[PDB]
Amino acid sequence: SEEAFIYEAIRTPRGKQKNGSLHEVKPLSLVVGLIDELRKRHPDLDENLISDVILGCVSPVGDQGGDIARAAVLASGMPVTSGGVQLNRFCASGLEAVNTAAQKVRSGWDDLVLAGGVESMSRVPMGSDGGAMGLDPATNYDVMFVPQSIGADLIATIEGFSREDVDAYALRSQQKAAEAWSGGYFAKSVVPVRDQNGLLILDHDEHMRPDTTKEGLAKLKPALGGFDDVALQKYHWVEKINHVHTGGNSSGIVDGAALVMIGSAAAGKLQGLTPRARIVATATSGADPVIMLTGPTPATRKVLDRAGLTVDDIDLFELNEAFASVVLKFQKDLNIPDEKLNVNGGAIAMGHPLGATGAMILGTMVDELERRNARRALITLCIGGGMGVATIIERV
Amino acid sequence: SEEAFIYEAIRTPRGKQKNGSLHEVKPLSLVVGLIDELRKRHPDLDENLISDVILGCVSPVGDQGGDIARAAVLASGMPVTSGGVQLNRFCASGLEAVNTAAQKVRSGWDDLVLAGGVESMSRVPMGSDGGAMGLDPATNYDVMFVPQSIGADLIATIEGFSREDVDAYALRSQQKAAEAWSGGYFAKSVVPVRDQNGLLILDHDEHMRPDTTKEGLAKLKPAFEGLAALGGFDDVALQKYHWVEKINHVHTGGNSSGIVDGAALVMIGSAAAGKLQGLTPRARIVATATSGADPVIMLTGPTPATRKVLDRAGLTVDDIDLFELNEAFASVVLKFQKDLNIPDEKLNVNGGAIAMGHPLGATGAMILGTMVDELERRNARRALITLCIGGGMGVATIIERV
Amino acid sequence: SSHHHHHHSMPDNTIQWDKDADGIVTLTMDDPSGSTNVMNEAYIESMGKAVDRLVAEKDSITGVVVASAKKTFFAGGDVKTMIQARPEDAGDVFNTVETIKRQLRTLETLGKPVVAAINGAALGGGLEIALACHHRIAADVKGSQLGLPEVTLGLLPGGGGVTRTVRMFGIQNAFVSVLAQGTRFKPAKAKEIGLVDELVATVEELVPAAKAWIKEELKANPDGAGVQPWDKKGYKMPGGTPSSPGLAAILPSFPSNLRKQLKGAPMPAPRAILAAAVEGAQVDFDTASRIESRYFASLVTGQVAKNMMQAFFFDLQAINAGGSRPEGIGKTPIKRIGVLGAGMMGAGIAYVSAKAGYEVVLKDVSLEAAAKGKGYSEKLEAKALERGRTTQERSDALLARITPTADAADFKGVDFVIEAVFENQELKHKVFGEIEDIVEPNAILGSNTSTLPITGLATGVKRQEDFIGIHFFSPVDKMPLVEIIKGEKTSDEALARVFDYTLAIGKTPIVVNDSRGFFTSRVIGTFVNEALAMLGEGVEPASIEQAGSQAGYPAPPLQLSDELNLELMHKIAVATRKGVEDAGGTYQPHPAEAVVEKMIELGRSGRLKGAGFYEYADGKRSGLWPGLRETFKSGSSQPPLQDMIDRMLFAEALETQKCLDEGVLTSTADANIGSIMGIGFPPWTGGSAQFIVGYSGPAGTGKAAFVARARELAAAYGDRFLPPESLLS
Ligand SMILES: Cc1cc(NS(=O)(=O)c2ccc(N)cc2)no1
Ligand SMILES: Cc1cc(NS(=O)(=O)c2ccc(N)cc2)no1
Ligand SMILES: Cc1cc(NS(=O)(=O)c2ccc(N)cc2)no1
């Protein structure tokens, strides 16, 4: 019945982990800044019609605890009837908020919902929230807990991706990310962060090393347990894991946030908003918790059956660059064309602010569909714990 | 478009805080015990059709961190495609999980979803996650941060609820909770917690004080065992409510919700979902609504949220057979009863959190399944469940028996 | 990242250099442009050169000593420059303190011990220079003070004070003790808390003890030489970090306890200090130091700082520098004071006069009443003995200078009369006539009058020259202002003698020309009347008191109206109504007069009669009278809270402009400080006159916006809010 439309999709720049510009900025004030930008774009928007604010956050502790979404509603002066809820599905928390918001609009019990995520990894490091899956000896044996870097190395070992193969995609992501910045692709969707005085704090992606060379990537080097032995205990047909993933061919640890406004056609009509894309379908899948990073392939196929589409029907494929082997495995399975996959750079170059990544690359595809005058795009991410998500958008 | 139905809604007994029985039980084990109970009810159910497990948790730290829902999916051996996600909307996280699960079914992109919550407050106390609204002086000023204890006393101050009034409802809750337990109302929905050897750990809401007397509640002292005992929050609250001279501190530990451990699980699915798995529907999710309120009183949220869910379903106050408001504080219920003219015989007929406890992230799903079993026992049709939320929010849900 | 202020394309030097054969550099600060080392543009470049030199010669330097060749050490910064910082200049303000702290951070992290030679006042930025050193030695000289009084001017310790004090004592202790109120510390108390480490007798021992401490530190502590406790691996912030469970349990109460004390007033300085302190404890030192700069630039470019810097610095300077004093006059010393009347005023005048070392004779109508007036001074010394703020040796000599008496001849040898009898004109003529001849001939004849003009009171004495108005404020032991009223026949020497007397007892004087109501009691009349009229209009008393407290007043208006006594407020209106009808006119009464007269009919006319707007029992104040709502139909009028606040602030600001127009006040400085220290005007406004030029409302900022808001109040409440022609065009 009610179709869900994307009206605005903005994001903050990504400040690097060490000596980052966003290290002095609380993660709450990052979300408030994006709320003020939506106010600037639509000053006559009736914020009373905004019924919920959904944010994704993998480490909701400290500066990110206590329902950071509700804190963003009250600190920004939004109406108290605007809700505010925080969710966490590991790496796909940002896109899960978008999907849940769209599903809330389709049910008819929500008219205008803000969705997104925030993750200040320099202030709240990964794993600060603890977790029974990793810090409880009973569970850490049942789920066969292994860090995602080893699951990625296990992917490259089985599929046959060499160190040069993963470093090739790493160099490719750095080149396409700089070309997007130089071309002004991210000019309108990247809202620079400023202090309480208006002074600039950050206006670009710091983690990008655009002058990367294939010789420098090979200089990089690839961790205190038997996670290798634990992984090979389930994958008994492979003798040794080839650790090909370094800091230059994996996702970057950065701080950042992203916001997406989702509503029905009547919500934008009443509030004078113009739709930019339509949420076609969403799907949730998973794969075994050892390899962990093979969720995209079954999740993408599931979202294609729902929409009745194939790989040849999609114009752009956006997969989160958590690790290089994850993208090469996803590209090899579905035979994704090399010119449709992460066309405006990826997380290896720009970063992976966990809870905000799924909402960042979501709006990134909204821009490229409108820039190329294309039609469809499929956004997917690999999830910790062995889950997978997928979302198809159609330009309007 | 697709109708969402409740097929099973179970919960664990609520173990008290000090010297509690569920203190030695990891909160993840509380959810796996409920997952294993569903398999005991329907051994032939193809769990591959379960696409998501949604749990509410207000303090997702320590034993409750790292997507505890996913840990439940993996530790209990559920299919790896069953997802898992935690959500935090303060006191209504348990119902927000069911409302989101229902909305996930209405979109048609999710068929069978498990929803509920978990909160082991004897192991993970409130505030363990921190938060900018509390631990940031800039945010703590813009958002006039005042704990729920003062907002409850402020409601009783404005509406004129005396100390005997709030203590009268506390006795009322303890009485109706004991009648429900002694009457066997909870026999089939409160799954007793056992250990790795099948030995009994807890099979009742051990926070209940059933022999409570009016004279006993009067001897209790006003709340001064938390952040409220520090100071300033009374001055801060009256700076916005400047027409009020003095806040009458009437809420004690006997007329407020109990600090307990517990968990709840609800299975929501479409009409075709339960048909394929051979599940008999018990109730239908009619409508949900979410409206907030002023963040200083922060507990008047149930009043507008109940009206918006009635207007969406085309129903009035007279069409609801049972009302279930979370007994966070006595004044929150008296305010809700005074506003909408709720008859006394329909409001929390089987006790509430004052007697049985309030396991934050799991309460919304606990009191939800309570009404699903009471609608069938009374053979009534409609029931409305609502909660007051921290920060000044509200969530209401209408269910219809099938 | 450079120690200098310009990377592009001529100030003086204020720091000397001296390296010894041991390798110790003595940085002696000596600014030639003034008698006090300030944190001006010259100091930044002077220190920028020295710190650059400490690095290029680090191979021949073993330690550093920071000394001063002035009486003080380093008192404050350049207020004349900061008060002009526009919001556009936020980038330059941020880079300035970031450059200042970049110098101190290198001095601090030099691998060599740095000792401070605090030879005097180390206030504000000066203490920030000392806190950057690794060891501090203070000379226990008289007059030396150490603190961070940046909050009193509307600013914050932006040269590392907030970051370093929290690193030494934690968030809670550094905020309360040093940062929040900017309290000044004596050298003994400074060593006691942790600001200073050692003490010496004279200033000639500082540099020797500084170099001696360097030699022993390099000898017995070679590894930790020149390393602060937070630059080590195992630094544990005292009291914990915001991520600590013990501190997290009480951290949410700091903004509420601060809002409890500020009473909801718009003072962003303490709020910003607490923010920078907590945000600073979450990150490293350098990241915290940068956050401190952003909150600092947030205050300098604001309006509250420009009001507090104008009043509590520039306006306070002109007053203490003889701006209101009559010029070309000598100082006639005082030998013995005689206070007439031993009430709450007369006893308070006798205490503050005897505390300064003056022999005071306390006369009343009986020995039972005069000795009981001296008991007001005894009951305060027993409080200062328990708190440990004075010694028995110095307190027994304090009460010994108070001679209570009832015989008028005991006023022999008195060269300074301060009358505090009842508000009755012919009584003051009667009181002064009894003793005008017994006192010395050229004695000051002062009168603590509230409304009666000094010109009329002077007719009851033979020498109208030495008759002057010395207006005090109860409680006299705490109120720091003395309103001096100049009668028509009052000479100029009497103005200067009472001016010097005010500074002698540690108070602030203002000079006011003789007029009905003077300036203090007249303007405060428009304050309590706007609240009383508001109560008669049907506004809730709780909302009135809340609006009065959130405006910035020390006491709410209805509470003040009980201590001001409503029967005297009825007498003022009858006196004002008489003067208009005596001149053949038509008196337009104030809407508050009917509220006063109604309280008289009910018998609740203030605290003195045990009942007023509040209920009084057991001496203390209980609460608002329950019969107040049904009497005035409270609740039938619910105006916005900001309208209640503005109606009280604008009534005084507009009434202050009349005093400047009518010739009552002669300077804008006496209008601001006289209203702040006299009637308790909110300090964030910078004074009742500064409130006009520095008004910051939602419609604008400045005199044009003040007039606009006055016309909003005028069209909605009455013509009394109409701005005079002196504010228009
Ligand atoms: C540390 C840390 C956090 C973290 N979370 S994770 O990478 O999301 C993860 C979750 C489940 C499993 N089974 C493995 C990894 N993993 O390590
Ligand atoms: C401490 C602490 C946390 C906490 N959580 S809370 O009760 O959910 C809450 C949330 C928002 C506001 N404004 C007040 C209280 N309450 O006290
Ligand atoms: C403060 C302060 C000064 C002050 N002046 S005062 O002279 O005491 C006074 C007396 C009566 C009336 N109606 C007004 C002021 N009163 O409080």
Q: Is C254 at the interface with chain B, CB within 8 A?
A: yes
Task: Mark whether A253 and A289 lie in a shared domain.
Answer: no
Closest atom, ligand 1, to C-alpha of A144? 13
- Cβ separation C253–B141 shorter than 8 A: no
- Cβ separation B295–A68 shorter than 8 A: no
Contact status, residue A153 vs residue A244, Cβ threshold 8 Å: yes
Nearest CA to ligand 3 atom 1: C679
Q: Neighbours of C (≥3 Cβ pairs closer than 8 A)? A: A, B
Scored b (16 or more CB within 10 A) or e, A254-291 reads: bbbbbbbbbbbbebbeebebebbbbbbbbbbbbbbbbb
The rounded distance, in Å, linking the Cα atoms of B55 and B69 is: 6
Please tell me whether C448 is known to bind a ligand: yes
Q: Is B140 at the interface with chain C, CB within 8 A?
A: yes
Task: Mark whether B281 and B291 lie in a shared domain.
Answer: no
The rounded distance, in Å, linking the Cα atoms of A203 and A13 is: 6
Interface test mutation site (partner C, options B136, B242, B247, max chain C beta carbons within 10 A): B242
**Cα distances (angstroms) measured from residue A358 to each of A90, A92, A173, B185, B316:** 10, 6, 17, 45, 41
CB contacts < 8 A (A, B): 216
* Structure's resolution in angstroms: 3.0
Element (DSSP H or E) covering residue B30: helix B27-41
Q: Which of C423, C479, C520 to mutate to test the pocket of ligand 3 (most atoms within 8 A of CB)?
A: C520
Contact C14 CB / ligand 3 (< 6 Å):
no
- Cβ separation B230–C242 shorter than 8 A: no
Q: What size, in residues, is chain A?
A: 396
Element (DSSP H or E) covering residue C705: helix C703-717
The rounded distance, in Å, linking the Cα atoms of C319 and C499 is: 10
Task: Mark whether A35 and A180 lie in a shared domain.
Answer: no
CB atoms within 10 A of CB C235: 11
Task: Mark whether B240 and B294 lie in a shared domain.
Answer: no
Contact status, residue A126 vs residue A108, Cβ threshold 8 Å: no
Going by the DSSP 8-state scheme, the letter that residue C645 receives in this structure is: H
**Letter for the amino acid at C403?**
T
Contact status, residue A149 vs residue A320, Cβ threshold 8 Å: no
**Cα distances (angstroms) measured from residue C533 to each of B141, C517, C596:** 32, 20, 9
Contact residues, chain C, for B245 at CB < 8 Å: 541-542, 623-624
CB hemisphere CA count around C82 (13 angstroms): 32
The rounded distance, in Å, linking the Cα atoms of A382 and B265 is: 27
Q: Mind listing the domains of chain C with CATH numbers?
A: 1-333 (3.90.226.10), 334-517 (3.40.50.720), 518-729 (1.10.1040.50)
DSSP reduced 3-state for C644: helix
Angle formed at CA B351 by CA B348 and CA B357, multiple of 5 degrees: 120
* DSSP of C489-534: S--SHHHHHHHHHHHHTT-EEEEEE--TTTTHHHHHHHHHHHHHHH
Task: Mark whether A261 and A320 lie in a shared domain.
Answer: no
Contact C569 CB / ligand 3 (< 6 Å):
yes
DSSP reduced 3-state for C46: helix
Contact status, residue C543 vs residue C534, Cβ threshold 8 Å: no
Closest atom, ligand 3, to C-alpha of C471? 7
Q: Tell me how far apart the 2 most distant CA atoms of chain A are, in Å.
A: 63
**Letter for the amino acid at C120?**
G
- Give me ligand 2 centre to Cα A111, in Å: 27
Going by the DSSP 8-state scheme, the letter that residue C676 receives in this structure is: I
The rounded distance, in Å, linking the Cα atoms of C184 and C178 is: 8
Q: Neighbours of A (≥3 Cβ pairs closer than 8 A)? A: B, C
For B137, the domain range is 132-184+286-399
Q: Considering only CA atoms, which of B102, B333, B158, B395 is closest in space to residue A81?
A: B395
Q: Give me the residues of C, 588-607, that contact A with CB < 8 A.
A: none
Out of A244, A279, A314, pick the residue that ends a domain. A279
**Residue C24: strand pairing partners:** C63
Contact C521 CB / ligand 3 (< 6 Å):
yes
- Cβ separation A24–C283 shorter than 8 A: yes
Mutual angle of helices C41-56 and C90-108, in 10-degree steps: 40
Task: Mark whether B167 and B296 lie in a shared domain.
Answer: yes
Contact residues, chain C, for A130 at CB < 8 Å: none
Q: Give me the residues of B, 236-275, that contact C with CB < 8 A.
A: 236, 238-239, 242-246
Task: Mark whether B191 and B172 lie in a shared domain.
Answer: no
**Is residue A135 exposed (0-12), middle (13-18) or buried (19+ Cβ within 10 Å)?**
middle
Pick the residue from chain B with its C-alpha nearest to A26: B132
Nearest CA to ligand 3 atom 17: C679
Q: Considering only CA atoms, which of C361, C345, C350, C348 is closest in space to residue C406?
A: C361
Contact status, residue C217 vs residue C114, Cβ threshold 8 Å: no
Q: Is C696 at the interface with chain B, CB within 8 A?
A: no
Out of B285, B310, B344, pick the residue that ends a domain. B285
- Cβ separation A85–B89 shorter than 8 A: yes
Task: Mark whether A307 and A233 lie in a shared domain.
Answer: no
Q: How far is A193 from chain B (nearest CA, A)?
A: 18
Alpha carbon of residue A53 to chain centroid:
18
Residue A352 annotated in active site:
yes
Q: How far is C292 from chain A (nearest CA, A)?
A: 11
- Torsion sign (Cα): C125, C128, C133, C139: positive
Contact B144 CB / ligand 2 (< 6 Å):
no
Question: What pairing do the DSSP bridges indicate for beta strands C122-123 and C146-147?
Answer: parallel
Task: Mark whether A107 and A49 lie in a shared domain.
Answer: yes
Q: Can you tell me which residue has the tokens 């106390």?
A: B125
Q: Is the peptide bond before C441 cis (omega within 30 degrees of 0)?
A: no
Q: What size, in residues, is chain C?
A: 729
Q: Considering only CA atoms, which of A381, A229, A238, A236 is closest in space to residue A318?
A: A381
Interface test mutation site (partner A, options B68, B88, B146, B312, max chain A beta carbons within 10 A): B88
Strand ranges (E), A242-296: 254-263, 277-286
Q: Cα-flanking dihedrals φ and ψ of residue C531, to 5°?
A: -75, -40
Contact B361 CB / ligand 2 (< 6 Å):
no
Question: What pairing do the DSSP bridges indicate for beta strands A387-395 and A277-286?
Answer: antiparallel
- Cβ separation C294–A23 shorter than 8 A: no
- Cβ separation C283–A199 shorter than 8 A: no
Contact status, residue C277 vs residue C295, Cβ threshold 8 Å: no
Q: Into how many domains does chain B fold?
A: 2
Task: Mark whether B294 and B269 lie in a shared domain.
Answer: no
- Give me ligand 2 centre to Cα B146, in Å: 7
- Cβ separation C546–B242 shorter than 8 A: yes
- Cβ separation A70–B81 shorter than 8 A: no
Q: How far is B213 from chain A (nearest CA, A)?
A: 37
Out of B256, B285, B314, pick the residue that ends a domain. B285
Going by the DSSP 8-state scheme, the letter that residue C313 receives in this structure is: I
Pick the residue from chain A with its C-alpha nearest to B393: A83
- Give me ligand 3 centre to Cα A294, in Å: 81
Q: Considering only CA atoms, which of B236, B228, B231 is closest in space to residue B145?
A: B236
Contact C568 CB / ligand 3 (< 6 Å):
yes
Q: Neighbours of B (≥3 Cβ pairs closer than 8 A)? A: A, C
- Give me ligand 3 centre to Cα C521, in Å: 5
Helix ranges (H only) for C250-391 are 253-262, 268-280, 285-300, 304-309, 316-320, 344-354, 367-386
Please tell me whether C88 is known to bind a ligand: no
Q: Tell me how far apart the 2 most distant CA atoms of chain B are, in Å.
A: 63
Contacts of C90 (CB under 8 A, 6+ apart): A197, A198, A199, C297, C301
Contact residues, chain B, for C242 at CB < 8 Å: 130, 135
The rounded distance, in Å, linking the Cα atoms of C103 and C91 is: 19
Question: What pairing do the DSSP bridges indicate for beta strands A316-319 and A112-120?
Answer: unpaired
Task: Mark whether A136 and A205 lie in a shared domain.
Answer: no
Q: Can you tell me which residue has the tokens 């921290």?
A: B390
Q: Which of B61, B68, B70 to mutate to test the pocket of ligand 1 (most atoms within 8 A of CB)?
A: B70
For chain B, the C-alpha Rg in angstroms (whole number) is 20
Task: Mark whether A192 and A269 lie in a shared domain.
Answer: yes
Q: CATH number of the domain that A232 lies in?
A: 3.40.47.10
